[PDB]
Design a binder for this molecule. Structure first.
Ligand SMILES: O=P(O)(O)C(O)(C[n+]1cccc(-c2ccccc2)c1)P(=O)(O)O
Ligand SMILES: O=P(O)(O)C(O)(C[n+]1cccc(-c2ccccc2)c1)P(=O)(O)O
Ligand SMILES: C=C(C)CCOP(=O)(O)OP(=O)(O)O
Ligand SMILES: C=C(C)CCOP(=O)(O)OP(=O)(O)O
Ligand SMILES: [Ca+2]
Ligand SMILES: [Ca+2]
Ligand SMILES: [Ca+2]
Ligand SMILES: [Ca+2]
Ligand SMILES: [Ca+2]
Ligand SMILES: [Ca+2]
Ligand code: NA
Ligand code: NA
Lengths: 362, 362
């Protein structure tokens, strides 16, 4: 990938800075520095880098479209990589905390961070907070004299909030919302009345689309000084459509992609998650199959899980996804065509992001 | 207190804004809005408000000093309250996450947030993230047109990082640091070689002094436009001295203050924490008593815990604390006197903060 080499070089630079700043400011010892390096590498590396690389792709596209000398181009590219790593570290933060919340086993082909024997959830919760803090530290340091510092902080923290609210929707989606009460425990739903297209869309848009699609695009624009050269409303809309689709893919793969290929072991079925599969099944399946689903969903029993996967196969959920996907490509291409009519350089960078998204296998 | 009524009014105002903003931006439903209101109230209220009210005390003192007119004074007081709630919500965030990490039972006289039957740690981890996000949201909204917004965000996030590094020191202090290895579990120490004055000071300065003492003081100066009026190094120094002492008090009270007065049930002894008591005991006790300590510390057995408390009592730990406190008083008074020679108004505000700290009972 065009910017992969540059992006990994900036990782090493940012890591050296962050760990060195801790030695300088917080009397960091050699052993905990080593721990923190291992934590950063394990939690921030090993993914696809779709988010981080997008920032760099967008920034370059927009910078090429402007007039600027070699030194200015180098600055935009370096700043873009730093911004990319801010988002990768925000991702790292979310996944550390998510893996604890989901009581998960594997992430990116390795044991989850909290599941490392020398860590535990008791330490990893705070390791996640360190990751989040580091992301802002990168902006404060590298962008100390840049005009876009304030706007970078604003959009980053807005998206942080947005994602935590999406996560709220996610973690509270298996209990009937009328029953949600801090003082009283409640069993998970038995009737699944709230497992609706609207409720699934609300979960995925806020928990995924903002930080995975909207944030990288906007940061690319901010570091290149071109945010005002694009249609804000249109950019948001295409980010939501692609981001919803990206999470739908994630939902589908939880059931249908081998964990060894995926690098993670999803338990959506065991945890009675309001996934795209669950919602699509419940709203399309015949009455007796809906009943059987309800009898078997949200159980850790392997036979119950196997019944759900077979019911999904019988209801042709993979084919139904392909129909959804066809509808999504149609909309995305239209939205991109509209963006292209306004700013062809930006629209090209949206195409690049979409191309890494469409029909992905992990 | 002078600003308690104003401060509580601003709470109601910021709460309405934050919940309203979620409705506007994230399609927040009535049930989850109610959940979030109860979460905010439970996690943000019921403390002493020393941090938040300090911001207002400092801002008022400096606004009077610089002869602000009625309209300017009202703005600074309202801004100060908002900054105060940023810190209270940062505190709320830390305590939510800490109660999970320490597996605690009570906070501020009520069950810990995660222990509310309708919550659990698996929801509460994210509730803590929401609180942290909300703190930045207040600044972005209320200070959108203020030139001090940049510096408020900078200091807030620097202190957030500092505190998480302090927390790293805290949670990794019961294992030999040379044995800190993500891939390998290691038992708690048996020799306690790292339970040193230096390591205790490092934990408490970073986990407590920055967010409890330095941050409220700096924010009061930032909102009143008076940071340039005071000695930065001297301010930092007095904040470190008071903050260390404040955490030493917290450590002492874990053992010697009844949970019902304190409002929380500490388990420093059961969890083999590197507390001021443990460190001071180990470095001053005769060898026979040190051996007894090692044979009983870090045990959940109530008799073992009682043995430790008896050892502390026999070693005159409370008297030793009183002697430390005398030395702190002497240093704080010297530092305040030097501040007073430079800016009397700010020195008075530090005196107010110190008066709420010195010989506190909870
Ligand atoms: O558990 P999910 O939801 O299926 C997953 O996609 C992670 N994820 C996605 C979006 C948001 C969050 C999230 C955001 C904030 C806080 C916690 C989690 C996690 P996974 O299949 O990769 O585990
Ligand atoms: O557990 P501690 O350390 O004794 C306590 O004082 C809370 N606290 C203090 C400082 C920092 C943090 C903290 C900061 C960041 C993350 C987690 C915890 C918690 P408690 O007696 O009130 O529980
Ligand atoms: C589905 C979401 C939003 C979480 C995983 O995101 P990715 O699939 O982008 O994970 P990495 O590439 O970062 O491993
Ligand atoms: C000792 C620390 C730093 C944690 C508790 O802080 P406080 O004792 O200030 O708690 P509240 O008043 O906020 O309850
Ligand atoms: Ca997960
Ligand atoms: Ca999850
Ligand atoms: Ca998933
Ligand atoms: Ca605690
Ligand atoms: Ca603790
Ligand atoms: Ca304590
Ligand atoms: Na499964
Ligand atoms: Na105890």
């Amino acid at each position: 990938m065009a910017h992969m080499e540059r992006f990994q070089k900036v990782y090493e630079e940012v890591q050296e800075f962050l760990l060195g700043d801790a030695e300088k400011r917080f009397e960091m010892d050699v052993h905990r520095k080593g721990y923190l390096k291992s934590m950063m590498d394990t939690t921030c590396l090993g993914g696809k880098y779709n988010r981080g690389l997008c920032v760099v792709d967008v920034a370059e596209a927009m910078a090429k479209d402007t007039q600027m000398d070699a030194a200015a181009m180098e600055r935009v590219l370096h700043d873009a990589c730093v911004c990319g790593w801010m988002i990768e570290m925000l991702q790292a933060h979310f996944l550390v905390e998510d893996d604890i919340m989901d009581h998960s086993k594997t992430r990116r082909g390795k044991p989850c961070w909290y599941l490392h024997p020398g860590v535990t959830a008791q330490v990893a919760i705070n390791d996640g907070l360190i990751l989040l803090a580091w992301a802002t530290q990168m902006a404060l340091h590298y962008f100390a004299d840049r005009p876009f510092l304030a706007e970078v902080l604003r959009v980053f923290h807005d998206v942080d909030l947005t994602t935590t609210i999406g996560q709220l929707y996610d973690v509270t989606s298996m209990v009937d919302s009328a029953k949600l009460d801090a003082k009283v425990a409640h069993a998970n739903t038995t009737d699944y009345v709230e497992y609706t297209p609207f409720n699934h869309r609300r979960i995925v848009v806020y928990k995924t689309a903002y930080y995975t699609y909207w944030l990288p695009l906007v940061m690319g624009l901010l570091v290149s000084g071109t945010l005002e050269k694009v249609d804000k409303k249109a950019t948001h809309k295409v980010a939501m459509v692609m981001g919803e689709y990206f999470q739908v893919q994630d939902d589908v793969m939880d059931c249908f992609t081998p964990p060894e290929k995926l690098g993670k072991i999803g338990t959506d079925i065991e945890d009675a998650k309001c996934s795209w599969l669950a919602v699509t099944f419940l709203t399309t399946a015949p009455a007796e199959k809906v009943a059987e689903f309800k009898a078997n969903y949200g159980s850790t029993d392997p036979a119950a899980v196997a019944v759900i996967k077979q019911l999904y196969t019988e209801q042709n959920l993979l084919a139904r996804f392909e129909e959804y996907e066809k509808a999504v490509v149609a909309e995305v291409e239209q939205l991109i065509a509209a963006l292209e009519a306004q700013n062809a350089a930006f629209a090209a960078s949206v195409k690049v992001l979409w191309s890494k998204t469409y029909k992905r296998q992990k």
